[PDB]
Amino acid sequence: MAFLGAAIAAGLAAVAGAIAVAIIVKATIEGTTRQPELRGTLQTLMFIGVPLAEAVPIIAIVISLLILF
Amino acid sequence: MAFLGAAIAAGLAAVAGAIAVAIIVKATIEGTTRQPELRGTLQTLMFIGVPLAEAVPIIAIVISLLILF
Amino acid sequence: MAFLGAAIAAGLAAVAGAIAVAIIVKATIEGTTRQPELRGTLQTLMFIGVPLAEAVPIIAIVISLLILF
Amino acid sequence: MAFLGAAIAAGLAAVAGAIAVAIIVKATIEGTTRQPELRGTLQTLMFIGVPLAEAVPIIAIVISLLILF
Amino acid sequence: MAFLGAAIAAGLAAVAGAIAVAIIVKATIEGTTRQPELRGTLQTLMFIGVPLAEAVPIIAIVISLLILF
Amino acid sequence: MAFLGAAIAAGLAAVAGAIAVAIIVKATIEGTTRQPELRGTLQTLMFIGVPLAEAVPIIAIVISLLILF
Amino acid sequence: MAFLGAAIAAGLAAVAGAIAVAIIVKATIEGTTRQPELRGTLQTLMFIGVPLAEAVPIIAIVISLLILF
Amino acid sequence: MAFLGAAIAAGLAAVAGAIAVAIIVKATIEGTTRQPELRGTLQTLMFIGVPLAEAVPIIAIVISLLILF
Amino acid sequence: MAFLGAAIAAGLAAVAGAIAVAIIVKATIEGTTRQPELRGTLQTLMFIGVPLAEAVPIIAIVISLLILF
Amino acid sequence: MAFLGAAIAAGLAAVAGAIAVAIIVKATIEGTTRQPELRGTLQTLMFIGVPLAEAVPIIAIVISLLILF
Amino acid sequence: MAFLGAAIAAGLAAVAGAIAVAIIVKATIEGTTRQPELRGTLQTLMFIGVPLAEAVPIIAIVISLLILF
Amino acid sequence: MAFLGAAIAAGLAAVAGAIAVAIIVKATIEGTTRQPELRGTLQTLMFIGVPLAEAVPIIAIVISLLILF
Amino acid sequence: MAFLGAAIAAGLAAVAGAIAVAIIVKATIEGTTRQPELRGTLQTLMFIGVPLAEAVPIIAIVISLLILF
Ligand SMILES: CCCCCCCCCCCCO[C@@H]1O[C@H](CO)[C@@H](O[C@H]2O[C@H](CO)[C@@H](O)[C@H](O)[C@H]2O)[C@H](O)[C@H]1O
Ligand SMILES: CCCCCCCCCCCCOP(=O)([O-])OCC[N+](C)(C)C
Ligand SMILES: CCCCCCCCCCCCOP(=O)([O-])OCC[N+](C)(C)C
Ligand SMILES: CCCCCCCCCCCCOP(=O)([O-])OCC[N+](C)(C)C
Ligand SMILES: CCCCCCCCCCCCOP(=O)([O-])OCC[N+](C)(C)C
Ligand SMILES: CCCCCCCCCCCCOP(=O)([O-])OCC[N+](C)(C)C
Ligand SMILES: CCCCCCCCCCCCOP(=O)([O-])OCC[N+](C)(C)C
Ligand SMILES: CCCCCCCCCCCCOP(=O)([O-])OCC[N+](C)(C)C
Ligand SMILES: CCCCCCCCCCCCOP(=O)([O-])OCC[N+](C)(C)C
Ligand SMILES: CCCCCCCCCCCCOP(=O)([O-])OCC[N+](C)(C)C
Ligand SMILES: CCCCCCCCCCCCOP(=O)([O-])OCC[N+](C)(C)C
Ligand SMILES: CCCCCCCCCCCCOP(=O)([O-])OCC[N+](C)(C)C
Ligand SMILES: CCCCCCCCCCCCOP(=O)([O-])OCC[N+](C)(C)C
Ligand SMILES: CCCCCCCCCCCCOP(=O)([O-])OCC[N+](C)(C)C
Ligand code: NA
Ligand code: NA
Ligand code: NA
Ligand code: NA
Ligand code: NA
Ligand code: NA
Ligand code: NA
Ligand code: NA
Ligand code: NA
Ligand code: NA
Numbered sequence: 094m095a096f097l098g099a100a101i102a103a104g105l106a107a108v109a110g111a112i113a114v115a116i117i118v119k120a121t122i123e124g125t126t127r128q129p130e131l132r133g134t135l136q137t138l139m140f141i142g143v144p145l146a147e148a149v150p151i152i153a154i155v156i157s158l159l160i161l162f
Numbered sequence: 163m164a165f166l167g168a169a170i171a172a173g174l175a176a177v178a179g180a181i182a183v184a185i186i187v188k189a190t191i192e193g194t195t196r197q198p199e200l201r202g203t204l205q206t207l208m209f210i211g212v213p214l215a216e217a218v219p220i221i222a223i224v225i226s227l228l229i230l231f
Numbered sequence: 232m233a234f235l236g237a238a239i240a241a242g243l244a245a246v247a248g249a250i251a252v253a254i255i256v257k258a259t260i261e262g263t264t265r266q267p268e269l270r271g272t273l274q275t276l277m278f279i280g281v282p283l284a285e286a287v288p289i290i291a292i293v294i295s296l297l298i299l300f
Numbered sequence: 301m302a303f304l305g306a307a308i309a310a311g312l313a314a315v316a317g318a319i320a321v322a323i324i325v326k327a328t329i330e331g332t333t334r335q336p337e338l339r340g341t342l343q344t345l346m347f348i349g350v351p352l353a354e355a356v357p358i359i360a361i362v363i364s365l366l367i368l369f
Numbered sequence: 370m371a372f373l374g375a376a377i378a379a380g381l382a383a384v385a386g387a388i389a390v391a392i393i394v395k396a397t398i399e400g401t402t403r404q405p406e407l408r409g410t411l412q413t414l415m416f417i418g419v420p421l422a423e424a425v426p427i428i429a430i431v432i433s434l435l436i437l438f
Numbered sequence: 439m440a441f442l443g444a445a446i447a448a449g450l451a452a453v454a455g456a457i458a459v460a461i462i463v464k465a466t467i468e469g470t471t472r473q474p475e476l477r478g479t480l481q482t483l484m485f486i487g488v489p490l491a492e493a494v495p496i497i498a499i500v501i502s503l504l505i506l507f
Numbered sequence: 508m509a510f511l512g513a514a515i516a517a518g519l520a521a522v523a524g525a526i527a528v529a530i531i532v533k534a535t536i537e538g539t540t541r542q543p544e545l546r547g548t549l550q551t552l553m554f555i556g557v558p559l560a561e562a563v564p565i566i567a568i569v570i571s572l573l574i575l576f
Numbered sequence: 577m578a579f580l581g582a583a584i585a586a587g588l589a590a591v592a593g594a595i596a597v598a599i600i601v602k603a604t605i606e607g608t609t610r611q612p613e614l615r616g617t618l619q620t621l622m623f624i625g626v627p628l629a630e631a632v633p634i635i636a637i638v639i640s641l642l643i644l645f
Numbered sequence: 646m647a648f649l650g651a652a653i654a655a656g657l658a659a660v661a662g663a664i665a666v667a668i669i670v671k672a673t674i675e676g677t678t679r680q681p682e683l684r685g686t687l688q689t690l691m692f693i694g695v696p697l698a699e700a701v702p703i704i705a706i707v708i709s710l711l712i713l714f
Numbered sequence: 715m716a717f718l719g720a721a722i723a724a725g726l727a728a729v730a731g732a733i734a735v736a737i738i739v740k741a742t743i744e745g746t747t748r749q750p751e752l753r754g755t756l757q758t759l760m761f762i763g764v765p766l767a768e769a770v771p772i773i774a775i776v777i778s779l780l781i782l783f
Numbered sequence: 784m785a786f787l788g789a790a791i792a793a794g795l796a797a798v799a800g801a802i803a804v805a806i807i808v809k810a811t812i813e814g815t816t817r818q819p820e821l822r823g824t825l826q827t828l829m830f831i832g833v834p835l836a837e838a839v840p841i842i843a844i845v846i847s848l849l850i851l852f
Numbered sequence: 853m854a855f856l857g858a859a860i861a862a863g864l865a866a867v868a869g870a871i872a873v874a875i876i877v878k879a880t881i882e883g884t885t886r887q888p889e890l891r892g893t894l895q896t897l898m899f900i901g902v903p904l905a906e907a908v909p910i911i912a913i914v915i916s917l918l919i920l921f
Numbered sequence: 922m923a924f925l926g927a928a929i930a931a932g933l934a935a936v937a938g939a940i941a942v943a944i945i946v947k948a949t950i951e952g953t954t955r956q957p958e959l960r961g962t963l964q965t966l967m968f969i970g971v972p973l974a975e976a977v978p979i980i981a982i983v984i985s986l987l988i989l990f
Contacts, residue, residue, distance in 0.1 A: 450518025
């Protein structure tokens with residue numbers, strides 16, 4: 094029940110983080126394609142957005158470990 | 163049961179927070195790409211929106227920990 | 232059974248509230264992008280909409296805690 | 301089972317209400333952006349629509365409480 | 370089992386009713402935006418449409434109570 | 439199991455009926471917005487379409503009651 | 508397990524029938540809006556399409572009762 | 577397990593058959609609206625497509641009864 | 646378990662076949678509407694695609710009976 | 715469990731093959747409608763794709779039989 | 784449990800392979816329709832893509848057999 | 853449970869890798885269709901992307917085998 | 922349950938990682954197709970975005986292995 098739990102926490106975190114990052118990176122690539130002169134600003138939004146999106150998934154990863162250990 | 167419970171809360175909190183942030187950040191990137199002069203304006207809305215969206219997932223994270231410990 | 236319930240109430244509340252906020256913020260960002268002179272109007276709509284959207288998820292959080300304590 | 305029941309009721313009510321409100325609020329923001337002169341009319345519709353949308357989720361929340369207590 | 374039942378009926382009725390109303394309300398907001406002259410006409414369709422969509426969810430709420438009592 | 443059954447039948451019926459009505463009413467609202475002179479014509483189709491869509495849901499409600507009683 | 512059976516069959520039939528009719532009616536309404544002259548012609552297609560769509564859901568209801576009785 | 581089985585096969589047959597027919601009828605309605613002179617040709621395609629779509633669902637309905645009886 | 650199994654195979658085969666036929670038929674209708682001159686060509690493609698699409702669902706039906714008997 | 719396994723394998727293969735074929739045939743119908751001159755080359759593409767798409771589902775059907783027998 | 788396992792692996796591999804192939808082939812058909820000069824180039828990409836997409840599903844089929852034997 | 857596990861890991865890996873490749877391949881086909889001059893530039897992106905997308909699915913295949921052995 | 926756990930974490934991480942990469946790679950291909958002169962800038966974004974998206978899935982695989990061992 095600890096294994097099963099740790100899996101669910103980690104698995105959902107993976108899905109959460111990957112997809113969120115993908116959405117953000119994709120938006121960045123599309124934006125940069127549309128407006129190459131906005132390279133920097135768009136790259137900044139990506140660099141701010143990604144960690145924000147990963148925050149809660151990262152915490153869920155820690156919780157997965159706490160369950161396992 | 164506490165392991166499984168803690169995993170469900172944290173896992174759904176991860177999905178919730180990550181995706182919500184991605185939607186907000188993507189909207190900010192797209193708006194910025196369309197009207198670069200609004201970059202500060204949209205950034206401000208992102209900075210307000212993200213914590214608002216992360217609030218409940220964060221509380222579910224705390225509940226996840228209360229279930230575990 | 233209590234751990235499982237608390238998690239389900241909290242996890243669904245997280246998904247509900249985060250995504251609802253994201254939808255509202257996204258709309259505010261898109262509206263402001265189209266009509267920047269209306270940002271104050273749109274912000275007021277966002278600041279009314281968000282708590283209204285968070286209302287039931289918050290009660291579900293409370294219900295989650297009542298299950299645990 | 302009272303715990304699981306209370307959770308399911310509260311969790312679904314939360315998804316139900318939050319998303320319903322968000323959809324209505326989004327429409328209002330989109331409409332107001334598109335026709336700023338209609339801002340009062342659309343705000344009235346939002347103020348009528350939100351309670352209507354929340355009516356059944358609220359009743360579900362009460363039922364959630366009746367099951368828990 | 371009665372608790373679980375009452376929760377499912379109430380939770381689904383909530384989702385059913387909330388989303389149906391939001392769909393209807395969103396439509397009259399968009400229509401009113403496109404044709405402000407049809408404000409009263411569209412609003413009437415909203416006031417006819419909502420009870421109809423809420424009819425079965427309400428009956429499910431009653432059924433939810435008959436299971437609890 | 440009768441409680442579960444009555445809940446599933448009533449719950450699904452609610453989702454079925456509410457959404458179906460919403461789809462029909464939205465189409466009526468959208469049609470009326472495009473063709474204000476066809477208001478009566480479209481309202482008639484709505485008044486014909488709603489009971490047909492509700493027919494099986496209300497039958498599932500009866501069955502929900504039969505299971506409960 | 509017969510209560511569960513009668514419920515699953517009735518609930519699905521409800522979703523099946525209600526949604527199918529909604530799709531057909533909405534199509535009739537949209538078509539009439541697009542080519543009003545064809546109102547009667549489309550209504551006949553609606554009156555033919557619905558019973559055909561409701562046929563198997565109706566059989567499923569009969570089966571639901573055969574299980575319950 | 578026969579009640580449950582019969583219900584699964586019948587419920588899934590209902591959804592399969594109803595939605596398939598609705599899709600074909602919607603297409604016929606949409607096409608008639610665009611090419612009124614093709615009315616008969618399109619109506620014929622509907623009268624061929626429906627039984628073919630309904631073929632397996634009907635068989636599944638039979639199989640449902642073989643389980644129930 | 647033979648009842649459940651047979652139900653799952655038959656039920657999924659019904660969804661598979663019915664929906665696939667609906668998709669193919671819809672496409673034949675839309676094409677015919679688009680180019681009435683190709684009415685027989687598209688009709689041939691429909692008469693070829695449907696049996697191919699129904700192939701595995703039919704086999705699944707046979708397997709369903711082999712489980713039942 | 716052999717009945718459950720054979721069902722799941724056959725049912726899923728049914729969905730897999732029927733839908734894949736439908737998607738390929740639909741595309742063939744739309745291409746032909748759009749460019750009737752390419753009818754031959756598109757029909758060839760359909761005759762290559764369909765067996766390729768049905769391959770693994772057919773293998774899964776064999777496995778379904780092995781499980782049964 | 785070996786039967787159930789083999790079914791899951793083979794069933795999901797079927798869905799994976801069929802749908803992936805359908806996606807790739809559909810793209811090939813659409814591009815060839817728009818630019819018939821490239822039918823050779825496009826068919827080559829289709830013939831490189833399909834085995835790649837089928838690789839892991841094929842492995843899952845092998846694993847399905849190892850479970851069975 | 854080792855049969856179950858190995859199947860889940862292989863099945864999900866199959867869906868992951870196949871769909872991922874299909875998406876990437878489709879993108880390559882669409883780009884090549886629009887800008888044939890970029891045929892080899894796009895093909896390189898496909899050859900970088902595919903193994904990157906297959907990475908984690910490959911590891912999940914190994915894990916599937918380790919579970920069985 | 923360790924087999925179940927290790928499977929769930931690996932399978933979900935597979936879906937997470939594969940889909941995310943495919944989304945980023947696709948966006949890179951589309952962008953490059955539209956602005957070939959930005960191929961280097963877009964490729965860089967792909968090489969930054971991919972490991973960011975794979976980060977949590979990779980961790981979830983490590984957790985998968987920690988469950989197996
Ligand atoms: C019934 C409808 C018939 C429509 C026929 C329309 C013909 C139009 C004129 C033909 C010219 C098209 O030219 C098209 O250009 C691209 C480059 O831009 C070519 O180039 C592509 O294929 C060649 C041949 O393998 C590769 O070496 C090359 O690297 C690749 O980019 C295509 O092979 C060619 O088909
Ligand atoms: C349980 C595992 C299931 C995982 C399912 C993951 C699904 C992820 C879907 C993410 C893809 C969405 O991308 P996006 O950037 O919004 O663009 C699409 C929207 N526009 C076209 C309007 C731009
Ligand atoms: C189980 C986990 C499933 C996760 C599924 C996540 C999918 C989230 C959808 C991705 C975000 C959708 O794009 P968006 O920002 O709304 O804008 C789309 C419209 N425009 C681009 C034109 C503005
Ligand atoms: C298990 C948890 C699953 C969570 C699934 C989350 C999915 C959230 C999807 C929400 C996406 C919101 O897009 P949208 O409002 O349609 O954008 C429309 C933009 N325009 C109006 C300009 C077109
Ligand atoms: C488990 C919980 C799952 C939560 C899933 C949430 C789904 C929310 C989907 C809501 C999507 C937004 O749609 P909408 O704004 O009505 O229309 C789009 C606006 N236009 C009409 C202009 C295009
Ligand atoms: C677990 C339960 C999760 C429930 C999730 C429910 C999500 C329901 C979202 C329904 C939003 C639909 O909006 P709408 O007004 O039809 O616009 C649709 C946009 N177009 C008009 C352009 C098509
Ligand atoms: C578990 C229960 C979850 C319930 C989820 C229900 C989802 C309901 C979505 C309903 C969407 C209704 O959109 P629609 O009027 O067909 O599109 C209109 C598009 N045009 C105007 C362009 C024609
Ligand atoms: C348990 C889950 C139950 C909820 C399921 C709800 C399903 C409703 C899906 C939507 C049904 C109505 O869309 P429709 O008329 O085909 O229009 C779409 C086609 N056009 C936009 C071109 C007109
Ligand atoms: C309870 C589980 C089953 C309930 C799910 C019901 C699903 C109903 C799906 C009906 C929606 C599809 O409609 P349609 O007419 O093909 O238009 C499709 C045209 N577009 C692709 C442009 C939207
Ligand atoms: C129990 C689960 C049952 C789920 C049943 C879901 C059925 C969904 C069927 C959806 C079929 C939609 O495709 P289609 O109308 O061919 O595309 C039409 C696209 N255009 C209009 C632009 C051409
Ligand atoms: C129980 C499980 C049942 C699952 C049933 C799933 C059915 C899914 C059917 C999906 C059909 C997708 O059609 P499509 O032509 O790609 O979209 C329309 C594309 N165009 C706009 C170019 C036309
Ligand atoms: C239980 C198993 C259910 C499987 C359901 C699978 C759904 C069908 C697969 C996805 C079909 C849609 O994607 P696609 O054909 O690449 O693009 C559609 C055409 N556009 C490019 C215009 C969007
Ligand atoms: C267990 C059941 C699994 C079912 C999995 C179904 C997967 C369906 C994936 C469908 C992915 C479709 O995305 P896409 O074609 O890249 O975008 C379409 C838009 N454009 C190409 C125009 C840009
Ligand atoms: C376990 C089941 C797994 C199902 C996974 C389904 C994956 C579908 C992900 C792809 C869905 C959306 O595609 P996309 O690339 O964002 O295109 C959006 C169109 N533009 C690129 C033009 C913006
Ligand atoms: Na974007
Ligand atoms: Na946006
Ligand atoms: Na908006
Ligand atoms: Na709107
Ligand atoms: Na509307
Ligand atoms: Na229509
Ligand atoms: Na059509
Ligand atoms: Na394509
Ligand atoms: Na593409
Ligand atoms: Na893109």
